Amino acid sequence: HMRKKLKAVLFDMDGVLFNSMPYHSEAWHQVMKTHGLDLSREEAYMHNGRTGASTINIVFQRELGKEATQEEIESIYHEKSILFNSYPEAERMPGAWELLQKVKSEGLTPMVVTGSGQLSLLERLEHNFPGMFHKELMVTAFDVKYGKPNPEPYLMALKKGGLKADEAVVIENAPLGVEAGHKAGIFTIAVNTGPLDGQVLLDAGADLLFPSMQTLCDSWDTIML
Helix axes 52-64, 70-85, angle to 10 degrees: 120
Residue type, 52: G
d(CA 39, CA 26): 10
Q: Distances in Å between the alpha carbon of 135 and those of 98, 119, 132, 144?
A: 21, 12, 11, 15
d(CA 65, CA 2): 46
Closest CA to 8 of 170, 159, 124: 170
- The count of other CB atoms within 10 Å of the CB of residue 3 is 11
Provide the H-helix boundaries in 13-69: 21-35, 41-46, 52-64
Query: Going from the N-terminus, what domains does the chain have, and what CATH number goes with each?
Result: 1-20+92-225 (3.40.50.1000), 21-91 (1.10.150.240)
d(CA 29, CA 38): 7
Question: In the 8-state DSSP scheme, what is residue 54?
Answer: H
Helix (H) or strand (E) holding 120: helix 119-128
Can you give the length of the chain in residues? 225
d(CA 144, CA 109): 21
d(CA 210, CA 94): 14
Instruction: Give the determination technique.
Output: X-ray
Resolution of the experimental structure, in angstroms: 2.0
Question: In the 8-state DSSP scheme, what is residue 166?
Answer: G
Helix (H, G, I), strand (E, B) or coil at 8: strand
- For the beta sheet containing 8-11, the strands, ordered from the edge strand earlier in sequence to the opposite edge, are 138-139, 109-113, 8-11, 168-172, 187-191, 208-210
Closest CA to 149 of 125, 176, 124: 176
d(CA 121, CA 123): 6
Closest CA to 171 of 6, 20, 3, 12: 12
Q: Distances in Å between the alpha carbon of 117 and those of 50, 81, 104, 145, 222?
A: 10, 9, 26, 13, 34
Contacts of 185 (CB under 8 A, 6+ apart): 151, 165, 166
Q: Where is the chain discontinuous (C–N over 2.5 Å), named by the preceding residue?
A: none
* Pair 177, 200: CB distance under 8 Å: no
